[PDB]
Design a protein around this ligand. Sequence first.
Ligand SMILES: O=S1(=O)O[C@@H]2[C@H](CO)[C@@H](O)[C@H](O)[C@@H](O)[C@@H]2O1
Ligand SMILES: [Ca+2]
Length: 768
Amino acid sequence: DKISHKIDIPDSAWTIGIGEKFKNAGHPNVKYPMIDDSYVQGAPLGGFGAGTIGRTYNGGFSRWHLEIGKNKYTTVYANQFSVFQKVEGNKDGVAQVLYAGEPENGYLSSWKWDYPKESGMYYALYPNSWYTYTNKDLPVQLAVKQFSPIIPYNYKETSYPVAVFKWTAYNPTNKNVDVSIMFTWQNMIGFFGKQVNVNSGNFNKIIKDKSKDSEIVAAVMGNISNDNEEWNGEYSIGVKKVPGVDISYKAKFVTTGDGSDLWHEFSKNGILDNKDDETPTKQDGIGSAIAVNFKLQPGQTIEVPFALSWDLPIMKFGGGDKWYKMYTKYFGKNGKNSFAILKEALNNYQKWEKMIDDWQKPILSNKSKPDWYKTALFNELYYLADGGTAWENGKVGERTNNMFGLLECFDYNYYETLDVRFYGSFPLVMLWPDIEKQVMRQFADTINVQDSSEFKVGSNGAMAVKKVQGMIPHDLGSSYALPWIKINAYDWQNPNIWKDLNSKYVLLVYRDYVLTGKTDKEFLKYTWKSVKTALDKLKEMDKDNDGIPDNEGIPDQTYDTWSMKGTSAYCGSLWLAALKAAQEIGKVLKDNEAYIKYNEWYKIAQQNFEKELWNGEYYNFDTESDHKDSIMADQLAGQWYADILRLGDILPKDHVQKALKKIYEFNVMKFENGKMGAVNGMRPDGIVDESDIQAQEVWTGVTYALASFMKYRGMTEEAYNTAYGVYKMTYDKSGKGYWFRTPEAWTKDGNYRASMYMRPLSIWSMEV
Ligand SMILES: O=S1(=O)O[C@@H]2[C@H](CO)[C@@H](O)[C@H](O)[C@@H](O)[C@@H]2O1
Ligand SMILES: [Ca+2]
């Protein structure tokens, strides 16, 4: 490998061999059907709300999130980079698709598949990823850096449906070598959303832009229709000319054929026919190809950028609503703007690389932090773009704001699940705070919505009211229904009786004020009525008059199957913290009566929480369950947020420290030797709590949250040891193969529940 000298991959990048077979992979541990797309994954391409495309470490464009809210795992085999090389003095060259695999649909048999093992590496430090190609039969070594411009505090380029592929080629040999690099792409108009005639009317065009020092050649893959539907728009691929390369292209090859129309050209001399052909297709699938050819002398390096864009301006949800995607603010809504997006990328990618470096540098340069932590911190961020992210720029057919939503996950297809976002929204408040405040305003606006229509609760078959006035919703809808319009899509349980949602809501509001500098009084004023309503409504659920809402021994908080009854450490502590936050907001907004009342409620509740739950070593799980003395990893969730919010001690420092040390000693170190995170419940005899499946699970996002709480309490070693098990399981050779699909949970056997999950974004709470 002579090429990793010529590029700049950070040591904290996650790495795997191209074509590597992973032997330990985990699978779902539930009986019901659940997504398992395998370990062949990579860092995604695409901005927020753009739809994303997962290109895997084997090279294939395989995890398709272009239909907003959906996960479709299928490799589109035509979509590839290929190489040709010919050593000066040899009669023939060699051509090779850079894909460690071969088609499963019978097509493109003429292409040279099966990129060999042990001949290159994949690296990822989101939003960047790289491939290196170090192959005994390719004398010129190649690398590519691929990315989308995902940039904190930037709401423009971060939205773009674009990717850049910056190639580097180096000749370590003593002979001249002819080299070509070819990007192929299928005209994917009709891949989803089109109910009949999926290819019909698709056509490809070639654009040559000859600006001084900025020559671009691109293919635009569109459809003859001007219909404004989710399916219609354009793809584009292209390249920018650099000194010493030439460009060639082929506008139309058939993807539902053997591929030789293209490949016989490429395999001869690495030069395409430059044949333009705008004829629309009927049934056949079609594609385009853009190539560069160059001669490298001994010792020579050259760099050349390609790009990909997708202008699919409309997202449709299953309940019928159609919305424009965010990037249309910058490029237009008519679906005929792929070239403009591509051109912007090819002309500005160096500036985008610097912007990414500038944001990653403070962390990367901090030599106190281990590399593994950096690997996880950056790579968990994949989910912000990959989680079905919806970011609207108007309803189709007809505002100041752009509504936003991130899915909980794909298996549980709910936008912004609040009990989860309490953990998973750290990166948004830290890095894209304007989006975070918009989401919270969305929740504020729902507080007094009432929908008295009844739904059947999935778990027990009881009927319940959809939305109760004064109760925060579980979620802002489903991609299968109507995001932002119809809330509480979740029906497996009744969230109107949950005991955590209203307290978490208030905590999130105050967090969002504190972590953006304690200056945004207008945000506190917008949300204040909803905060007061939320706490007042939750107070009504205190049936024994101890000042604390009572868990009911039935599904009533985020651990939906783990029954809490009476006062719980979890809900009780969140309540205490939410009261303290609201007192503070009352002081800021000069609402005396609120300050007065929430202080009184706090003092009573604090005294009783401590009396009811403090056992001398830790806080009991609850007051009334058979499992009341379980040690819960999340028992002091409210004090964790109180630390972040700078609200001081809700519980005594000594008792918090004892409890955290107990959780480390038990839930971490007695669970598979502390190598897999914090199990949720452990009995005081050191045996995992078997009262419910959730007690026997590690929750990745709970464990990262626990690690930040330990860190803030000076338990540095325990904090990183605790987090390390989650990193190991996710990313390491000894783990279970969950990279770019971190799950909610795993059991002690390492098998998982709910891949591609929002909660582990809580790792960013370790950077507070
Ligand atoms: O009912 S679920 O399967 O439970 C999931 C998690 C627990 O893993 C809950 O916290 C969340 O509120 C639910 O929307 C999910 O659907
Ligand atoms: Ca009570």
